[PDB]
Structures are given as structure tokens and as C-alpha cells.
Scaffold this active site. Structure first.
Site, mmCIF file in Angstrom:
data_model
loop_
_atom_site.group_PDB
_atom_site.id
_atom_site.type_symbol
_atom_site.label_atom_id
_atom_site.label_comp_id
_atom_site.label_asym_id
_atom_site.label_seq_id
_atom_site.Cartn_x
_atom_site.Cartn_y
_atom_site.Cartn_z
ATOM 1 N N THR A 104 0.855 -1.220 0.000
ATOM 2 C CA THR A 104 0.000 0.000 0.000
ATOM 3 C C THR A 104 0.870 1.242 0.000
ATOM 4 O O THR A 104 1.888 1.299 0.689
ATOM 5 C CB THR A 104 -0.932 0.057 1.227
ATOM 6 O OG1 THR A 104 -1.831 -1.060 1.205
ATOM 7 C CG2 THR A 104 -1.740 1.364 1.245
ATOM 8 N N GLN A 105 0.466 2.231 -0.788
ATOM 9 C CA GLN A 105 1.170 3.498 -0.848
ATOM 10 C C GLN A 105 0.172 4.595 -1.190
ATOM 11 O O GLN A 105 -1.042 4.404 -1.095
ATOM 12 C CB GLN A 105 2.308 3.475 -1.889
ATOM 13 C CG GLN A 105 2.660 2.125 -2.495
ATOM 14 C CD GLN A 105 1.766 1.772 -3.665
ATOM 15 O OE1 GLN A 105 0.554 1.631 -3.506
ATOM 16 N NE2 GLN A 105 2.358 1.639 -4.853
ATOM 17 N N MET A 109 -1.542 -6.567 -2.201
ATOM 18 C CA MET A 109 -1.744 -5.304 -1.473
ATOM 19 C C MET A 109 -0.631 -4.286 -1.750
ATOM 20 O O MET A 109 -0.232 -3.522 -0.867
ATOM 21 C CB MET A 109 -1.896 -5.562 0.035
ATOM 22 C CG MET A 109 -3.114 -6.398 0.394
ATOM 23 S SD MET A 109 -4.675 -5.567 0.024
ATOM 24 C CE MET A 109 -4.701 -4.310 1.303
ATOM 25 N N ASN A 110 -0.150 -4.282 -2.990
ATOM 26 C CA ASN A 110 0.900 -3.370 -3.430
ATOM 27 C C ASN A 110 0.654 -3.002 -4.890
ATOM 28 O O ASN A 110 1.377 -3.447 -5.783
ATOM 29 C CB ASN A 110 2.279 -4.018 -3.235
ATOM 30 C CG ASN A 110 3.425 -3.153 -3.745
ATOM 31 O OD1 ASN A 110 4.381 -3.672 -4.325
ATOM 32 N ND2 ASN A 110 3.343 -1.843 -3.537
#
Lengths: 243, 233
Positions: free
Chosen positions: B1-2, B107-108
């Protein structure tokens, strides 16, 4: 005795007999050559037509690495393919990190170190191929030849396989008669001739000619196969010289 | 996540009788700061495909490198790399769609919305969308971000359904795209006047237009607008 039974063992001479036996597999293979020209390189190979059932122009031997490097080899064909696959991984990781396409000397060492690593252990076999390769980079044209030991040097002209002596003699004449240099289109013609002349060592079966080239002017520094009219022109030139 | 840092806004596109058109402005925004004014967000793949990307620019440049590497890899041991075994728009899209959905599943995500526009071997128009969630869909018109809200309504007046595609010429389609880009410049606070446009036609091939500008703007009526209600002067 028994020193030749295991790879990476030094004989009392200081020799690695397993690597020397790998050279015998290379000497048994078909003839392949490389010619360094003014602004690039030319690669050519002898393809033995074992049968009429072989589809012409389909069983391609010369391989591209990245978009600027050409690779050809003599000996065990699968071993050459394995080496080129590694070369492609090496070139990709170089370009990934450093952005610029891999220089030819840099690429030469990547293959060299990998082949050399297969002379360090008895759990692996040496490569049964001598690989002629090269292309165009920022510093210009480069031609290399790599042996089963991992040994490689830069070359003006290179040859390997069953007709290497005949080829080498022909390459030596070109170096002497053209000190100022040879053009790309000339090199393709000469490459065709040398393969035809080198075919006398494999004269039982007829063969198919395959040529490729990288040139700053003719191909924008990219590796391309010689096809159609330019290929036929080189074949006609070659056939005229033997007669 | 970002979180996305340097971002690109709308990518808009539509089908027409003989091919597809796609467009996107040349801005790389840094929040409200209009930081980078020379960013190319349409990336051609061969002579038959253009990938338009919005969202995070660092992830765009990563995707650009993947496509560049995809062309290199396809050429390996492929005598028909520039003919029958060349990269198709459908191949390029499915690859990206696989990567996008894989990355969201770890999740990236690659923080982007992507439109792949092109023409297939048989001459069929290709136009499909994919984003950071791995969601995909196709439509006669496709647009990302603000384009979805403002460009699609305008482009759908030209091609409202599949049967309108053969009736739509390249001149009418390009006109609609250029008008949509003007409307986005009026109304999108993270857009620029400068943009690129690409046409992929089954006959005339790939036409890539750079350094286009929004023109024929209406601003004169602004002089008559005074105050916010009661003010006369």
C-alpha cells in the site's frame, strides 16, 4: 591416471581434460564464423541439410540477445541455447539497473564468467560449444569468440567448428588485404563465400546458408537477419567464387 | 500500500469506423502543484497499439519499461516478430491486466488507470480499460478520471452503441476527442493545455501527434460577470 574422469580436476600437467573433451564436441559441430567490419559485425553459419524433409529457412541457428547483440555457436546446439538464455538474463538485469543497453565487452565477460563457473565443480559439465558473438555499442563494433574453458578474446575475424582451419585461412587473407577496413555489405558477401569454402570439410551432405548482421549504417546498430534479395545476392557471389 | 505522488490526469479514447483514437495531456502534477509540463503519457507498442496511462507517474515509467522489455522478449527466437507473431493489442492488454490484478492481490498496487487502444491482425478495433484494482471493461468510448465524467458524455453522443461505429469517420471522431480535451481544460483543475493524440487506423497505421494545444476557447463572456449577486460595478 583418472584425472580426465571428473570436471574441475587438474591433471599433473595443470590441465582440465574435461574442458579439452568439450572442445572435441565443438570441433565435431558445423562451421560458424564472425566478421568484424567498418561499423559493425557479420555472423554466418553452416546448416547441414540432413534430409529433404527439413523445412528450408525454419530451423534458425543464429540467436539475438537484447536488440543489438548477435550470437552463433558450433557444437552441442542445446548448450548454446542455454548460454544465450543466460546472456539474455544478464543483458536484461544490466539494462534494468543501468538503463543503457549492455556494452559488448561487458556482455562478453558475463558469458565468460558463467562458462568459467562450469569448470569449477565436478557437479556440472563444461559447455560443449564455442560461441561467436558481438554487435554495436557506444564505443563502436565488437566481435568476440568464447571457448568451453570460459576463455574469450576480441577478434577481427573468428571461426569455429569442423571447417575452422579453412575459414581461418580465408579470414586471414581479408585482414591482410583490407587494413583500412571492410564494409558491412562486403562482409556479408565475404561471409557467404567463407561458409561455402568451409563446406568442403562437410562435403557429403548439402547445406543451407544463414547470415545475420549488426551495422551502424545498414541496420541502425540493431541485429537483423539477412533475407531475400540481399541473401540471394550473397549466395550468388559465393557460388561464383567456388567455380 | 502506498499513495500516488506525481500524477497524470484523464486519458480519453473512442472507436471509429476504421480504428481507434486515444489522447492524454502532458502534465505531471504534484498534488495541487502543476510540477512537470513535458510528460508523455501515451506510449506506443509496435505500430498497432498505444497504451494511455493515468495516475502515478513513477508506476507509469515502470509499466513503460515492462512494455519495452515485452517487445524485446517477443523478438527472441521469433523470425515472424515483425509479421504474424508480432505483439497484438489484446496480448499487451492481457499482460498488463494480469500484472495489475496480481499487484492488487499482494496489497501493493500499481496506482494507475490504463487504456490500451489498438487494431488487431484481422482489422478489428481494440479498446479496453484496466486499473489498480485489476478491474477491466470495454466500451465504444473509454475515459479515466475526470474524463469518465466529462469526456464520455460528449463522446457517447457520437458513438452511443456498437452500430454507430461504422457510421463514425476519423474526422468526426478526432473532432470529438479534441473538443473533449478543451472541456477538460475548462473544468479539470489538474489538467494542462498541452496534450498528445494518437490514431491507430487499420489502413493508414499509427499516427502519433505531439505538442497539440487546446484552441478556440470561449472566455470573452467573463468580462460581463461582476460580483456574486448584487454587485453592479
Amino acid at each position: 591416471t583418472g584425472y580426465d574422469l571428473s570436471n574441475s580436476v587438474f591433471s599433473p600437467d595443470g590441465r582440465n581434460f574435461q574442458v579439452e573433451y568439450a572442445v572435441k564436441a565443438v570441433e565435431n559441430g558445423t562451421t560458424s564464423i564472425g566478421i568484424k567490419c567498418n561499423d559493425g559485425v557479420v555472423f554466418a553459419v553452416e546448416k547441414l541439410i540432413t534430409s529433404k524433409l527439413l523445412v528450408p529457412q525454419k530451423n534458425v541457428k543464429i540467436q539475438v540477445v537484447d536488440r543489438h547483440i548477435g550470437c552463433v555457436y558450433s557444437g552441442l546446439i542445446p548448450d548454446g541455447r542455454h548460454l544465450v538464455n543466460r546472456g539474455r538474463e544478464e543483458a536484461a538485469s544490466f539494462k534494468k539497473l543501468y538503463k543503457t543497453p549492455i556494452p559488448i565487452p561487458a556482455f562478453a565477460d558475463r558469458l565468460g564468467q558463467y562458462v568459467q563457473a562450469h569448470t569449477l565443480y565436478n557437479s556440472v559439465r563444461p559447455f560443449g560449444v564455442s560461441t561467436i558473438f558481438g554487435g554495436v555499442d557506444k564505443n563502436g563494433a565488437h566481435l568476440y569468440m568464447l571457448e568451453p574453458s570460459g576463455s574469450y578474446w576480441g577478434y577481427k575475424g573468428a571461426a569455429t567448428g569442423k571447417g575452422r582451419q579453412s575459414a581461418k585461412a580465408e579470414l586471414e587473407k581479408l585482414v591482410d588485404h583490407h587494413p583500412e577496413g571492410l564494409s558491412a555489405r562486403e562482409a556479408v558477401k565475404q561471409a557467404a563465400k567463407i561458409i561455402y569454402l568451409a563446406h568442403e570439410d562437410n562435403k557429403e551432405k548439402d547445406f543451407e546458408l544463414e547470415i545475420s548482421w549488426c551495422s551502424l549504417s545498414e541496420t541502425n546498430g540493431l541485429h537483423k537477419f539477412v533475407k531475400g534479395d540481399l541473401l540471394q545476392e550473397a549466395i550468388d557471389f559465393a557460388q561464383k567464387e567456388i567455380n | 500500500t502506498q499513495q500516488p505522488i506525481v500524477t497524470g490526469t484523464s486519458v480519453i479514447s473512442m472507436k471509429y469506423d476504421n480504428g481507434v483514437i486515444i489522447a492524454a495531456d502532458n502534465l505531471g502534477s504534484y498534488g495541487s502543484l502543476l510540477r512537470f509540463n513535458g510528460v508523455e503519457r501515451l506510449i506506443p507498442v509496435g505500430d498497432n497499439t498505444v497504451v494511455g496511462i493515468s495516475g502515478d507517474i513513477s508506476d507509469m515509467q515502470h509499466i513503460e519499461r515492462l512494455l519495452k522489455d515485452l517487445v524485446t522478449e517477443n523478438a527472441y527466437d521469433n523470425p515472424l516478430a515483425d509479421a504474424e507473431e508480432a505483439l497484438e493489442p489484446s496480448y499487451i492488454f492481457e499482460y498488463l491486466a494480469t500484472v495489475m490484478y496480481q499487484r492488487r492481490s499482494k496489497m501493493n498496487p500499481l496506482w494507475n488507470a490504463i487504456i490500451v487502444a489498438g487494431v488487431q491482425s484481422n482489422g478489428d478495433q481494440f479498446l479496453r480499460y484496466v486499473n489498480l484494482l485489476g478491474v477491466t471493461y470495454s466500451s465504444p468510448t473509454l475515459a479515466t478520471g475526470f474524463g469518465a465524467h466529462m469526456a464520455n458524455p460528449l463522446l457517447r453522443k457520437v458513438v452511443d452503441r456498437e452500430s454507430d461505429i461504422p457510421k463514425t469517420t476519423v474526422q468526426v471522431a478526432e473532432e470529438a476527442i479534441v473538443n473533449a480535451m478543451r472541456v477538460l481544460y475548462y473544468r479539470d483543475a489538474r489538467s494542462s493545455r498541452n496534450f498528445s493524440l494518437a490514431i491507430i487506423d487499420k489502413n493508414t497505421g499509427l499516427t502519433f501527434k505531439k505538442n497539440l494545444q487546446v484552441e478556440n476557447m470561449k472566455w470573452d463572456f467573463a468580462k460581463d460577470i461582476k460580483g456574486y449577486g448584487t454587485q453592479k460595478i
